[PDB]
Each structure stands twice: as structure tokens, then as C-alpha cells.
């Protein structure tokens, strides 16, 4: 099989080993140094047809080709970041949406960077749904959900809007009770956390976010 990169990343864009150190690590001294058409048969003989025939229409004008760039990867291939305060089990605070000011429990970061967020539903009526980390305030309260098993099918396509009235399907309810049945026993170990997740967050007189510790 293809061996891994024998040059560890010392720094960004810098390899740990030189050209001569990698030559010894790889032992390079042991090394040394169409069909654009298809044929078909018919009932006057055989006809050779051409794949991708010439266009039947040409526009009056055409846009020139763009220049070649680099580093402009699509969104699916982008690097995903996550704040160090957002660890699996932290109680987040939603800022936008209908559930704004409500407190949720962070479970896992999805491949597209969005955070899998749960209420749970049995506490503050917030099901398993995505949530952006930019629109979320992470508190300093963490619950140990290392034993919580999240099913693999909870991907971004699972929470992608199906695009005439929305209705929660039986799969969403089953995946809700599968995760809630594991969070409720460990939430009860932390006293006064059942009502803390029920409560909503809001700024009162004299409370300034630049000096409030979350």
C-alpha cells in the first residue's frame, strides 16, 4: 500500500526533514531512475457513430474562459474550524432562530462545520438540529457525554431541508428518543441542571457581556 508522508509537519509549509534526510528515510538508492467513436449495426450494413457530435446551435456571443487560480477549493473541501470552548458536552446558548436565548447541549460537529445541537427535547422542546458556531455562545458548563452513542446517519443531508407543511417524521422522533434516553440520566447527576436548560438567557439591567463570564 501507499506509505504515509514520511515528512512530519514541523510548521505550516515546512517539512521537518531535508531533501537528504528524506532520501535516507525513503531509501531512493534502491529505486531505478481515446476512442472518440463507437460502431453500431443496423438493418444498410454497419454505421459508425461519433460520441459528442457537433453542436446544433451556436450563440451570437460567447464569454471568454476565466484564468487559472489556486486555493479556491469548494465548500465541501474547506477546512473546518471549532472554538476551543466548544467541546462535546458544553451547554451552548443559541442567539438566532426561534429558539434564541435558549440553552442547548453540544453533541458533535458535522462535516460542514455546523454543530449537532440538542435540547434535549424533553427539557426545552429543542430537538436534535444543526447550529452554527458563530451564532452560539459557549458556556463553561460541560456534561460528560463520552458514553453517549450518536448514530452515524446524523449527517448534514439528514438535517437538510426537504423543501407544503413541515411535519416531524417518525425517524426524527426515534432518533430523538435514542439520544435523549442517554442524556437524561447524566443530566440528573448535575443538580439544578434540569431547570437551567429549561430557562432562557437574556440581558437584564447592568449585565454587560464584555464582563460577564459564561
Amino acid at each position: 500500500k501507499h506509505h504515509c508522508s514520511r515528512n512530519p509537519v514541523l510548521a505550516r509549509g515546512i517539512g521537518k526533514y531535508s531533501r537528504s534526510a528524506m532520501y535516507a528515510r525513503k531509501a531512493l538508492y534502491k529505486r531505478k531512475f481515446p476512442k472518440v467513436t463507437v460502431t453500431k449495426t443496423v438493418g444498410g450494413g454497419t454505421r459508425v457513430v461519433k460520441l459528442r457530435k457537433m453542436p446544433r446551435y451556436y450563440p451570437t456571443e460567447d464569454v471568454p474562459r476565466k484564468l487559472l487560480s489556486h486555493g479556491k477549493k469548494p465548500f465541501s473541501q474547506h477546512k473546518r474550524k471549532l472554538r476551543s470552548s466548544i467541546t462535546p458536552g458544553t451547554v451552548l446558548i443559541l442567539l438566532n432562530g426561534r429558539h434564541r436565548g435558549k440553552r442547548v447541549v453540544f453533541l458533535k460537529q458535522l462535516p460542514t462545520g455546523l454543530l449537532l445541537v440538542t435540547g434535549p427535547l424533553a427539557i426545552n422542546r429543542i430537538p436534535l438540529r444543526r447550529a452554527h458556531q458563530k451564532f452560539v455562545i459557549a458556556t463553561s458548563t460541560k456534561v460528560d457525554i463520552s458514553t453517549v452513542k450518536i448514530p452515524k446517519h446524523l449527517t448534514d443531508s439528514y438535517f437538510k431541508k426537504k423543501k407544503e407543511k413541515y411535519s416531524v417524521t417518525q425517524q426524527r422522533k426515534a432518533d430523538q428518543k435514542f439520544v435523549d434516553s442517554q442524556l437524561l440520566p447524566l443530566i440528573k447527576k448535575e443538580p439544578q441542571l434540569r431547570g437551567y436548560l429549561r430557562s432562557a438567557f437574556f440581558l437584564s439591567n447592568g449585565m454587560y457581556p464584555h464582563k460577564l463570564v459564561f
Binding site: 446544433r56 446551435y57 451556436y58 450563440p59
Partner: protein
Amino acid sequence: SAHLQWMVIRNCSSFIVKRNHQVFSTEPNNLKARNSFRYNGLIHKKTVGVQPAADGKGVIVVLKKRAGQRKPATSYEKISINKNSRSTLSSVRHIIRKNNYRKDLRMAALRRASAILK
């Protein structure tokens, strides 16, 4: 003497239409309707003219004969092509590319023939 005839018809022609900062030519053998040296349809010994057919369907590829220079009655050879869109373009492409007849106006005549068929 195309370049000699160009300097006369460069800015003085009954076909030149100068307005809205644009210059268009109304000569019959112009493919882009553009008043330029290359696309001017009366200046060169080899001109390509893609006109609509006399009826509502088909195009007319007008070529300028080699010996038909100072005799306008027998100077242009018209080619009526009434086929499907893909085959009509293949005919115009072969008239220009295979004959080495104004290869610079090859795609200019294909885009004009495509607009006439609409």
C-alpha cells in the same frame, strides 16, 4: 488592393451606421454587421455571406468567385442549404474549412447561420 480600398471605405460608406458610439455596416456580405477590415463584405476577393433563404426556411451561403471580381452579375455563387440545424452548420463549416475560403470567417458564419435558423 483590399487595403487600398479599405482606406477609402474606412470612414466614408453608404453602409456605415455610426450612432450610440457604435459603427455597424449594412453591406450584404458582412457576417458580424461590423465595420471592420476583416468582416467587410465588399473589399476582399473572398467574401462569405450567410443570408436567409427566399422563403421562410433555409439559409443561403454566398461565396465570391475568384474570376467574378469586376463582373457583379456573375461574381457571387449562392448555396441554398435547407437541412437540419446540425447538418446546415456542418455544410457551412466544410464550405469554409475544406476550401480554405476565409477560414477567419468560419465560426463567424456558423454563428450567423445559427441565428438565421431561429
